[PDB]
């Protein structure tokens, strides 16, 4: 609603992120309703580090997937219980593993045998039983030319499962809880997702057949993409097919197994708009440039809507040609005071950007819900920048 | 010195930035000695926002070029006097212009006629005389196909000088102090720099001939690049030729004019190394991956040195394939504990990166000088992340 947005800029200084909390909830509940109850959704915190948004998901029953001790802290700030937190990452420091073990979370998802040994040492030191899952890099490709999967820095190749399981079994203070497969972000190929998830459920079966172990948790990953430029995923097909496959596993060998589908982008991308005001308008060498008050330092990832036709380039306030929101775009003439709205800015936005580049204040974040507006992140200050320097 | 670096990792937690302050000073003094004294060097703060490093340049007599009210604050923290601060930028908010006018800095470098009018309004409100310079986008190309310059969001086309000067003259509380030309960063073409600078000095002459005004300040910009992959600029030729050209102007129409050469990258790039420790080593689909504890969140821009041959990919600790320091690089086998050093990391490093992406602590920065080591930026904390959220 342009009228709503315009009215908001009178009370909140641009540039800012505006989140539609009503949409976030409806969008999530629609996904939840179509998915087998044995599958629990986990919010990927790296997609958006705002604890106020994370709290909403916590209240709805989602778990949270963190990738650092820092995110673990944010997750606790958001109220996620330890039993609903999993720790992923290819380069966890021992200090991070230490805090994770001390926190007694659902599980640390190990990505190397050496990591498993570190966890065991820490479990012994802390006199605790550390829960671990293993991230597997499938030896299968889900357009791909070569068979056998892709070389990745993440997890451990499926072919190394024997070595991995031998290690986990030898670590007396560690308990194996399951597996995790995540093939990448912004996946817009419906069948590739279904195939990967079914493959992961099958890996669970292989583990029982080869080791007699029943995975307590099978994390199917996800990487559900959202169209930015592109067709949307057939969420109905994914949820229906995977739910049926999971139920079959549930009705046989995995009656008490928790299945997880992780999501960052799909849950939040379309729920926010980045609102920026046009500051200046100029012509240069036959072209027209419109300079707005927001940019790369707030939304590096950067559809757009304009609030009051020509070829124009929309640039941010930074001193670099890279701060371009739109090059040679055709839109009605924009003038100082007009608002440029960047759509689908709810994921990989603020925290994905070089917030301190050129010293501009970080943007305000607003959450709209139940007919009200809540400030969920204050405007940054110069002191926020020098904090680590003084 | 590998021995030095190794010893430092015992006292300082990796990943961290290490700056050779002895080099910074020697490097600067060599540049200074070869340059006409009528030319003053200005540090571009956006290249590195550490006030402790900026202070060194302030002590040596350099001015500072800021691009936001935030950087203006940092400049004052570093001790730069108002008369040695200039404010650049294509999208300055009125609030930024207000603080700039209230600070009485050497000059605000305007990039539009509308900006000039805003400055005048503020000068009137604050009962002050605002000093302004104008950023000109030359109608000349300095390999380029088309003549006449390039369309840019920065400054005002040279062809609009009449309109610009008519505006400045009509603003009674504003004093015109000069011009500024900056063609871009990482310029490794020696002659293009010399040509641009001479062209800028000539613009000063044109302004006197057409308006009878003598520029108090002519900012030649710079954009001196440094080789990362490439041949180094012939600094000797640039300093000699431009110095002679400036002296000629000095001996005729511009006897008391301050000439400025700005630099960010050239002054700091080669003075720092980003030190990261190898955490894990693994093989995946026939390839070898080495995971280090530093990455994109600290040095997004990313030569490298290794401290104890194969084809290997060096990846950071982030949960994204984009966190790659080196792909398919040939280097002696790296193992956990080894150190990977990223060279020429002194400019566009930390503040140019998405520091809060995935919640890892910002890195420590160390300054080596006169045989000692000084901590110039403490390790980040989870509280630094939630500050704006609570
Ligand atoms: C980033 C990440 C996610 C979330 O991905 P989206 O594409 O945002 O849904 C899930 N799992 C892991 C292991 C991740 O690193
Ligand atoms: C970034 C910038 C500089 C510094 O550029 P370097 O390439 O780092 O020397 C100088 N002047 C302006 C106007 C800038 O925006």
mmCIF file of C-alpha atoms in Angstrom, chain A residues 13-15 46-47 49-52 65-71 73-74 77 88-97 111-112 114-115 118 135 137-140 148-158 160 182 279-287 289 291-293 296 313 315-324 336 348 350-362 365 376-390, chain B residues 13-15 46-47 49-52 65-71 73-74 77 88-97 111-112 114-115 118 135 137-140 148-158 160 182 279-287 289 291-293 296 313 315-324 336 348 350-362 365 376-390:
data_model
loop_
_atom_site.group_PDB
_atom_site.id
_atom_site.type_symbol
_atom_site.label_atom_id
_atom_site.label_comp_id
_atom_site.label_asym_id
_atom_site.label_seq_id
_atom_site.Cartn_x
_atom_site.Cartn_y
_atom_site.Cartn_z
ATOM 1 C CA UNK A 13 13.479 8.023 8.470
ATOM 2 C CA UNK A 14 14.413 6.349 5.188
ATOM 3 C CA UNK A 15 16.029 4.171 4.120
ATOM 4 C CA UNK A 46 21.687 -16.337 8.543
ATOM 5 C CA UNK A 47 18.890 -15.235 6.191
ATOM 6 C CA UNK A 49 19.489 -11.873 12.090
ATOM 7 C CA UNK A 50 16.702 -9.770 13.580
ATOM 8 C CA UNK A 51 15.744 -11.463 16.853
ATOM 9 C CA UNK A 52 12.273 -9.919 16.808
ATOM 10 C CA UNK A 65 19.615 -23.443 12.512
ATOM 11 C CA UNK A 66 22.620 -21.355 13.593
ATOM 12 C CA UNK A 67 26.035 -21.176 11.940
ATOM 13 C CA UNK A 68 28.179 -19.623 14.662
ATOM 14 C CA UNK A 69 28.386 -19.127 18.407
ATOM 15 C CA UNK A 70 27.227 -15.605 17.644
ATOM 16 C CA UNK A 71 24.034 -16.856 16.013
ATOM 17 C CA UNK A 73 23.528 -16.263 21.201
ATOM 18 C CA UNK A 74 20.968 -14.554 18.958
ATOM 19 C CA UNK A 77 17.935 -14.037 22.730
ATOM 20 C CA UNK A 88 25.792 -26.022 11.194
ATOM 21 C CA UNK A 89 29.068 -24.900 9.610
ATOM 22 C CA UNK A 90 32.253 -26.100 7.820
ATOM 23 C CA UNK A 91 34.661 -24.144 10.003
ATOM 24 C CA UNK A 92 33.589 -24.179 13.626
ATOM 25 C CA UNK A 93 36.335 -23.036 15.998
ATOM 26 C CA UNK A 94 36.944 -25.119 19.106
ATOM 27 C CA UNK A 95 35.705 -22.147 21.139
ATOM 28 C CA UNK A 96 32.401 -22.307 19.243
ATOM 29 C CA UNK A 97 32.177 -26.066 19.730
ATOM 30 C CA UNK A 111 31.361 -31.542 8.958
ATOM 31 C CA UNK A 112 34.595 -33.479 9.541
ATOM 32 C CA UNK A 114 38.389 -34.019 13.282
ATOM 33 C CA UNK A 115 35.446 -31.900 14.424
ATOM 34 C CA UNK A 118 37.072 -32.060 19.171
ATOM 35 C CA UNK A 135 26.402 -33.340 7.241
ATOM 36 C CA UNK A 137 27.672 -34.325 0.710
ATOM 37 C CA UNK A 138 25.657 -36.757 -1.484
ATOM 38 C CA UNK A 139 27.584 -38.726 -4.087
ATOM 39 C CA UNK A 140 24.747 -37.934 -6.472
ATOM 40 C CA UNK A 148 28.390 -38.543 -8.408
ATOM 41 C CA UNK A 149 27.665 -35.157 -6.871
ATOM 42 C CA UNK A 150 29.729 -31.989 -6.633
ATOM 43 C CA UNK A 151 33.011 -31.289 -4.799
ATOM 44 C CA UNK A 152 32.141 -29.055 -1.841
ATOM 45 C CA UNK A 153 33.807 -27.695 1.287
ATOM 46 C CA UNK A 154 30.653 -28.671 3.165
ATOM 47 C CA UNK A 155 30.199 -31.839 5.168
ATOM 48 C CA UNK A 156 31.661 -35.201 4.272
ATOM 49 C CA UNK A 157 31.293 -37.166 1.041
ATOM 50 C CA UNK A 158 28.738 -39.967 1.239
ATOM 51 C CA UNK A 160 33.235 -41.636 3.647
ATOM 52 C CA UNK A 182 21.700 -29.300 2.146
ATOM 53 C CA UNK A 279 17.483 12.676 -2.982
ATOM 54 C CA UNK A 280 18.770 14.061 -6.285
ATOM 55 C CA UNK A 281 18.086 13.818 -10.015
ATOM 56 C CA UNK A 282 20.588 14.645 -12.740
ATOM 57 C CA UNK A 283 21.477 14.169 -16.376
ATOM 58 C CA UNK A 284 24.970 13.051 -17.375
ATOM 59 C CA UNK A 285 26.236 12.449 -20.906
ATOM 60 C CA UNK A 286 22.714 11.954 -22.236
ATOM 61 C CA UNK A 287 21.626 9.626 -19.439
ATOM 62 C CA UNK A 289 20.594 9.314 -12.871
ATOM 63 C CA UNK A 291 20.191 9.112 -6.428
ATOM 64 C CA UNK A 292 18.347 7.559 -3.482
ATOM 65 C CA UNK A 293 19.258 7.573 0.218
ATOM 66 C CA UNK A 296 24.676 -1.353 -1.118
ATOM 67 C CA UNK A 313 19.836 4.505 -13.572
ATOM 68 C CA UNK A 315 22.108 4.857 -7.670
ATOM 69 C CA UNK A 316 22.643 4.880 -3.926
ATOM 70 C CA UNK A 317 24.499 7.500 -1.809
ATOM 71 C CA UNK A 318 27.825 5.642 -1.672
ATOM 72 C CA UNK A 319 31.013 6.866 -3.328
ATOM 73 C CA UNK A 320 31.327 3.910 -5.701
ATOM 74 C CA UNK A 321 29.755 3.063 -9.081
ATOM 75 C CA UNK A 322 28.906 -0.342 -7.614
ATOM 76 C CA UNK A 323 26.132 1.245 -5.552
ATOM 77 C CA UNK A 324 23.519 0.768 -8.266
ATOM 78 C CA UNK A 336 13.438 14.210 -5.304
ATOM 79 C CA UNK A 348 19.898 -11.792 2.892
ATOM 80 C CA UNK A 350 20.874 -5.944 6.097
ATOM 81 C CA UNK A 351 23.219 -8.482 7.717
ATOM 82 C CA UNK A 352 24.346 -9.615 4.255
ATOM 83 C CA UNK A 353 25.576 -6.092 3.488
ATOM 84 C CA UNK A 354 28.733 -4.073 4.349
ATOM 85 C CA UNK A 355 26.812 -2.031 6.923
ATOM 86 C CA UNK A 356 29.774 0.133 7.960
ATOM 87 C CA UNK A 357 31.136 0.895 4.487
ATOM 88 C CA UNK A 358 31.320 4.713 4.211
ATOM 89 C CA UNK A 359 30.014 5.182 7.750
ATOM 90 C CA UNK A 360 26.287 5.671 7.129
ATOM 91 C CA UNK A 361 23.884 4.756 9.951
ATOM 92 C CA UNK A 362 22.468 1.226 9.720
ATOM 93 C CA UNK A 365 13.623 -2.000 10.621
ATOM 94 C CA UNK A 376 12.555 -3.801 15.620
ATOM 95 C CA UNK A 377 15.937 -2.171 14.984
ATOM 96 C CA UNK A 378 16.967 1.399 15.750
ATOM 97 C CA UNK A 379 18.927 3.661 13.426
ATOM 98 C CA UNK A 380 22.679 3.142 13.711
ATOM 99 C CA UNK A 381 25.006 5.748 15.198
ATOM 100 C CA UNK A 382 28.616 6.785 14.682
ATOM 101 C CA UNK A 383 29.319 5.284 18.100
ATOM 102 C CA UNK A 384 28.239 1.871 16.816
ATOM 103 C CA UNK A 385 31.142 2.116 14.368
ATOM 104 C CA UNK A 386 33.897 3.116 16.813
ATOM 105 C CA UNK A 387 32.745 0.735 19.548
ATOM 106 C CA UNK A 388 35.334 -1.910 18.651
ATOM 107 C CA UNK A 389 37.938 0.817 18.099
ATOM 108 C CA UNK A 390 37.790 2.565 21.473
ATOM 109 C CA UNK B 13 43.290 -14.814 18.043
ATOM 110 C CA UNK B 14 42.931 -15.336 14.295
ATOM 111 C CA UNK B 15 41.594 -14.222 11.957
ATOM 112 C CA UNK B 46 36.299 4.902 3.104
ATOM 113 C CA UNK B 47 39.359 2.793 2.234
ATOM 114 C CA UNK B 49 37.738 3.335 8.832
ATOM 115 C CA UNK B 50 40.173 2.576 11.643
ATOM 116 C CA UNK B 51 40.713 5.866 13.482
ATOM 117 C CA UNK B 52 44.077 4.731 14.834
ATOM 118 C CA UNK B 65 38.086 13.094 2.610
ATOM 119 C CA UNK B 66 34.861 11.847 4.223
ATOM 120 C CA UNK B 67 31.723 10.607 2.478
ATOM 121 C CA UNK B 68 29.130 10.769 5.246
ATOM 122 C CA UNK B 69 28.348 12.470 8.534
ATOM 123 C CA UNK B 70 29.443 9.192 10.079
ATOM 124 C CA UNK B 71 32.897 9.447 8.521
ATOM 125 C CA UNK B 73 32.600 11.917 13.140
ATOM 126 C CA UNK B 74 35.383 9.360 12.667
ATOM 127 C CA UNK B 77 37.797 11.208 16.469
ATOM 128 C CA UNK B 88 32.298 14.186 -0.834
ATOM 129 C CA UNK B 89 29.245 12.214 -1.969
ATOM 130 C CA UNK B 90 26.419 12.042 -4.572
ATOM 131 C CA UNK B 91 23.626 11.555 -2.052
ATOM 132 C CA UNK B 92 24.150 13.682 1.027
ATOM 133 C CA UNK B 93 21.033 13.956 3.190
ATOM 134 C CA UNK B 94 20.068 17.402 4.442
ATOM 135 C CA UNK B 95 20.853 16.163 7.957
ATOM 136 C CA UNK B 96 24.405 15.374 6.818
ATOM 137 C CA UNK B 97 24.728 18.755 5.120
ATOM 138 C CA UNK B 111 27.383 17.207 -6.595
ATOM 139 C CA UNK B 112 24.193 18.981 -7.697
ATOM 140 C CA UNK B 114 19.915 21.368 -5.531
ATOM 141 C CA UNK B 115 22.555 20.405 -2.969
ATOM 142 C CA UNK B 118 20.253 23.147 0.550
ATOM 143 C CA UNK B 135 32.620 17.945 -8.271
ATOM 144 C CA UNK B 137 32.379 15.003 -14.314
ATOM 145 C CA UNK B 138 34.807 15.857 -17.171
ATOM 146 C CA UNK B 139 33.381 15.915 -20.682
ATOM 147 C CA UNK B 140 36.500 14.046 -21.748
ATOM 148 C CA UNK B 148 33.216 13.283 -24.203
ATOM 149 C CA UNK B 149 33.548 11.399 -20.932
ATOM 150 C CA UNK B 150 31.327 8.830 -19.253
ATOM 151 C CA UNK B 151 27.780 9.139 -17.856
ATOM 152 C CA UNK B 152 28.099 9.013 -14.063
ATOM 153 C CA UNK B 153 25.926 9.587 -11.004
ATOM 154 C CA UNK B 154 28.808 11.599 -9.565
ATOM 155 C CA UNK B 155 29.107 15.361 -9.666
ATOM 156 C CA UNK B 156 27.951 17.554 -12.511
ATOM 157 C CA UNK B 157 28.884 17.361 -16.189
ATOM 158 C CA UNK B 158 31.508 19.897 -17.235
ATOM 159 C CA UNK B 160 26.787 22.426 -16.892
ATOM 160 C CA UNK B 182 37.834 11.955 -9.421
ATOM 161 C CA UNK B 279 40.817 -25.310 10.792
ATOM 162 C CA UNK B 280 39.970 -28.378 8.707
ATOM 163 C CA UNK B 281 41.209 -30.257 5.645
ATOM 164 C CA UNK B 282 39.103 -32.595 3.532
ATOM 165 C CA UNK B 283 38.786 -34.302 0.181
ATOM 166 C CA UNK B 284 35.535 -34.108 -1.780
ATOM 167 C CA UNK B 285 34.835 -35.668 -5.171
ATOM 168 C CA UNK B 286 38.535 -35.850 -6.009
ATOM 169 C CA UNK B 287 39.303 -32.301 -4.895
ATOM 170 C CA UNK B 289 39.363 -28.280 0.408
ATOM 171 C CA UNK B 291 38.817 -24.450 5.580
ATOM 172 C CA UNK B 292 40.274 -21.420 7.364
ATOM 173 C CA UNK B 293 38.825 -19.380 10.238
ATOM 174 C CA UNK B 296 34.084 -13.038 3.302
ATOM 175 C CA UNK B 313 40.439 -24.683 -2.769
ATOM 176 C CA UNK B 315 37.303 -21.739 1.881
ATOM 177 C CA UNK B 316 36.219 -19.663 4.852
ATOM 178 C CA UNK B 317 33.951 -20.709 7.776
ATOM 179 C CA UNK B 318 30.731 -19.256 6.344
ATOM 180 C CA UNK B 319 27.770 -21.348 5.221
ATOM 181 C CA UNK B 320 27.949 -20.271 1.576
ATOM 182 C CA UNK B 321 30.041 -21.414 -1.412
ATOM 183 C CA UNK B 322 30.821 -17.741 -2.023
ATOM 184 C CA UNK B 323 33.182 -17.753 0.959
ATOM 185 C CA UNK B 324 36.187 -18.775 -1.125
ATOM 186 C CA UNK B 336 45.085 -27.699 10.377
ATOM 187 C CA UNK B 348 38.693 -1.954 1.357
ATOM 188 C CA UNK B 350 36.982 -5.000 7.120
ATOM 189 C CA UNK B 351 34.544 -2.103 6.650
ATOM 190 C CA UNK B 352 33.996 -3.181 3.034
ATOM 191 C CA UNK B 353 32.731 -6.572 4.223
ATOM 192 C CA UNK B 354 29.392 -7.893 5.596
ATOM 193 C CA UNK B 355 30.813 -8.030 9.124
ATOM 194 C CA UNK B 356 27.633 -9.362 10.750
ATOM 195 C CA UNK B 357 26.767 -12.016 8.163
ATOM 196 C CA UNK B 358 26.450 -15.324 10.072
ATOM 197 C CA UNK B 359 27.194 -13.647 13.401
ATOM 198 C CA UNK B 360 30.945 -14.229 13.726
ATOM 199 C CA UNK B 361 32.943 -11.768 15.854
ATOM 200 C CA UNK B 362 34.540 -8.927 13.879
ATOM 201 C CA UNK B 365 43.293 -5.352 14.095
ATOM 202 C CA UNK B 376 43.690 -0.992 17.290
ATOM 203 C CA UNK B 377 40.369 -2.850 17.195
ATOM 204 C CA UNK B 378 39.072 -5.404 19.684
ATOM 205 C CA UNK B 379 37.376 -8.671 18.787
ATOM 206 C CA UNK B 380 33.651 -8.257 18.169
ATOM 207 C CA UNK B 381 31.011 -9.668 20.505
ATOM 208 C CA UNK B 382 27.473 -10.980 20.138
ATOM 209 C CA UNK B 383 26.342 -7.844 21.957
ATOM 210 C CA UNK B 384 27.757 -5.710 19.145
ATOM 211 C CA UNK B 385 25.241 -7.432 16.867
ATOM 212 C CA UNK B 386 22.111 -6.999 19.009
ATOM 213 C CA UNK B 387 22.953 -3.438 20.050
ATOM 214 C CA UNK B 388 20.651 -1.888 17.443
ATOM 215 C CA UNK B 389 18.034 -4.566 18.153
ATOM 216 C CA UNK B 390 17.600 -4.089 21.900
#
